[PDB]
Structure 1
Amino acid sequence: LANKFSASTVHLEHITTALSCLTPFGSKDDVLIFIDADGLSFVRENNHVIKIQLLLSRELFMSYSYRNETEDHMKLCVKINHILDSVSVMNRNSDDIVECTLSYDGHGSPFVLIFEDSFISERVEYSTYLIKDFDTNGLELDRERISFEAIIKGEALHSALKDLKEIGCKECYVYAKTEANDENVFALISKSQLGFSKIKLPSNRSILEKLQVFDGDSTTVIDGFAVIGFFDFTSFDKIRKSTKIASKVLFRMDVHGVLSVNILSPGIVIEVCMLEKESIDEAAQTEIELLME
């Protein structure tokens, strides 16, 4: 096509899955679209405290063309509600849709989405908006100061998130500890109307693939030291829908109070970065210690 960017696919599941994953960040707000030869990424942020980035690589599309030469990437901003409503109305006959094509012709042009059926094609153009001064790259994990890392099965984490949601969890605490004899302890401690509750992940290489505590430098492994991260459940729970489709989840917490969750479902990949609370109250610390000891 003559457009600067044009990608067409025959798998409508990826698009609807991406919209489903982006929904928990607000049904009425902005979404940033990054386009480059590598692929197309959707980015959303909430309250300068949480961020989600979902990537769609070239392989997911049966055709992918990025003809821009002046710039190696293109940035645009759209309204999530517009896309949601348009797709919901257009995707009513999901059995008949055979092709979906996204297109963009640079700054000043709309983001074009076309659903192509056997004999009927529906073309929608979404108006674009100026991108906010806030930089998505601002909230990122310091790769050189990882406090701890862990690998978890998607099903178990999703079930734990469901349990936390169903009890009205208000505050969440991620507890990670390592000892000798390949002993690992990863747990989520919730403060809710029920009081303090705990969900412990088994120390087996079936759900908790690996856990390591790096002493805040990503290099030296230390045993007997517990890393505790305090988060508001309002932000922590936003990864539930991404975990629903997740095959594996990688948690990485740094010393600056940043938690990164990498979710793997050729495929859809998600990265959620969240900030932790300033400090943990004495009562919460005592209750966590009592629960873990």
Structure 2
Amino acid sequence: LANKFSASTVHLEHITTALSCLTPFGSKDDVLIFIDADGLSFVRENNHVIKIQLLLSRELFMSYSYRNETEDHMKLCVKINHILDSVSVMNRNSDDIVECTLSYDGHGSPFVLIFEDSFISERVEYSTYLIKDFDTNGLELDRERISFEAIIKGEALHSALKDLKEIGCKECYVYAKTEANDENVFALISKSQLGFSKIKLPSNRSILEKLQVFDGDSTTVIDGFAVIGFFDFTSFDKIRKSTKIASKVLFRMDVHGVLSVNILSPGIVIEVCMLEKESIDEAAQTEIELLME
């Protein structure tokens, strides 16, 4: 095509899945679209405290053309409510839709979404907006100062998130500890109306594939030390939709209080970065210690 970027596919599950994953970040706000030869990424940020990035790779599209030469990537911003409404009306007859193509022609042009059916094609153009000065790359995991890492199965994490949500969890604490004889302890401690509750993942290579505590440098493994991360549930719960489709989840917390969740569902890959609370109260610390001991 004559467009700078044009990607067409026959699977409509990827688009709706990505939109559903992005929904928990606000039904009426902005979404950033990054376009490059590797693929197309959707980025959202909330309150400068949490960030989500969902990547659709080149393999997911039956055809993918990126003819831009001056710039190696293209950045645009759209309103999520517009896309949500347009797709909801256009996707009412989900059985008949056969092709879906995205297109873009550089700055100053709309983002074009076309649903192609057997004999009817629907074309919608989304207006673009200036990108806010805030840089989404600011909230990133310092890969040289990982406090701990863990690999978890998607279903168990999704069940834990559902349990936390249903009890009206208000504060969450991620507790990670390692010992000898391959003893691992990964737990989520919730402060809610019920008081203090705990959800502990088993130390087996089917729900907790691996767990490591690196003493805040990613190199030296230390046993007997416990890493505790304090988060507000309003931001922690925003990964529930992503975990619903997730096949594997990788938690990585650094010393700067940044937690990164890598969700793997050819596929959809999601990155969620969140900041930790300023500090933990004495009562919360005492309750957590009593729960874990």
Q: Which TM-score band (shorter chain)?
A: over 0.9
Aligned equivalents of 1:11, 1:55: Cα separation in 2:
16
How far is the alpha carbon of 1:32 from its aligned partner? 0.1
The residue number in structure 1 matching 2:106 is 106
Please give the secondary structure, in 2, of the residue aligned with 1:223. Answer: coil
Identity %: 100
Query: What do the CA deviations read for 1:47-88 (whole angstroms, capped 9, x no partner)?
Result: 000000000000000000000000000000000000000000
How many Å separate the matches in 1 of 2:292 and 2:136? Answer: 36
Report what 2:45 is aligned to: 45
* Structure 1 residue 140: Cα displacement: 0.1
TM-superposed CA distance for 1:205, in Å, is 0.2
After superposing on structure 2, the runs of 4+ consecutive aligned residues of structure 1 that deviate more than 3 Å are: none
Instruction: Write the deviation string for residues 142-162 of structure 1: whole angstroms up to 9, x where unpaired.
Output: 000000000000000000000
In structure 2, runs of 5+ residues without a counterpart are none
> In 1, distance between residues paired with 2:28 and 2:223?
46
- Supply the distance in 1 between the matched residues of 2:136 and 2:165 (Cα, whole angstroms): 27
- The alignment yields a C-alpha RMSD, in angstroms, of 0.1
Structure 1: distance between partners of 2:121 and 2:101: 11
Determine helix, strand or coil for the equivalent of 1:93: coil
State how far apart, in whole Å, the 2-side matches of 1:184 and 1:57 are.
34
Deviation at 1:107, TM superposition (A): 0.0
Q: Identify unmatched segments of 5+ residues in structure 1.
A: none
Residue 288 of structure 1: CA displacement? 0.0
Distance in 2 (alpha carbons) for counterparts of 1:37 and 1:69: 11
How far residue 204 of structure 1 moved from its aligned partner, in angstroms, is 0.1
TM-score for both structures, normalised by structure 1: 1.00
Residues in 1 aligned to 2:219 and 2:139: alpha-carbon distance in whole angstroms:
22
Aligned equivalent of 1:282: 282
Deviations along 1:3-57, one digit per CA (max 9) or x if unpaired, are 0000000000000000000000000000000000000000000000000000000
Displacement of 1:106 in angstroms is: 0.2
Tell me the equivalent position of 1:117.
117
Number of aligned residues:
293
Asked if residue 178 in structure 1 is aligned to residue 144 in structure 2, the reply is: no
* CA–CA distance in structure 2, aligned partners of residues 161 and 12 of structure 1: 27
- What's the offset of the Cα at 1:98? 0.1
State how far apart, in whole Å, the 2-side matches of 1:194 and 1:47 are: 28
